[PDB]
Amino acid sequence: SNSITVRARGVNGQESVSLQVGGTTVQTWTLTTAMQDYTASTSLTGEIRVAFTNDATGRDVQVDYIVVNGQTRQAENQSVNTGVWANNQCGGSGNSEWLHCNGYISFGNVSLEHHHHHH
Ligand SMILES: [Ca+2]
């Protein structure tokens, strides 16, 4: 199976995030206010999302990165972010660690390719 580690925190420790692969929720965790590693495994190979699902007063999520089969993908390097509050709206910008609104950061398919090298 594929190994995925999510490194994230909540601002008030009430925040819940889900690891979704190809649209399937693989695991769900309540965050602490400290950056912490959370790990899961799956044979699924679809698009990886880290999803904040329980937005409320005082709740926000900050994601550092994920690790996929030993490879770090930085949250700030991801072009899809549907939760960051920017330009006065949810998902206002790519390339952010933040999920303020309910939404997600997409980290790409489990398997990526470059010059016929698969990683
Ligand atoms: Ca490979």
We report the CATH number of the domain holding residue 38 as: 2.60.60.40
Task: Identify each DSSP E strand in the chain by its residue range.
Answer: 2-10, 16-21, 24-30, 36-42, 47-52, 61-68, 71-74, 85-86, 89-90, 98-99, 103-109, 113-114, 117-118
On the CB side of 84, how many CA atoms lie within 13 Å of its CA? Answer: 19
Q: SS3 letters for 47-79? A: EEEEEECCCCCCCCEEEEEEEECCEEEEHHHCC
**Tokens representing 83?**
């939760």
- For residue 115, the CA-to-ligand 1 centroid distance in Å is 12
Question: How were these coordinates obtained?
Answer: X-ray
Count of domains for the chain: 1
User: H-type helices in the chain, by residue range?
Assistant: none
Residue 106, token pair as written in the block: 């997409």
User: What domain range is 115 assigned to?
Assistant: 1-119
* Ligand 1: centre distance to CA 84 (Å): 32
Tell me if 6 sits within 8 A of 43, measured CB to CB.
no
How far, in Å, from the CA of 116 to the mean position of ligand 1? 9
Ligand 1 centroid to residue 33 C-alpha, Å: 35
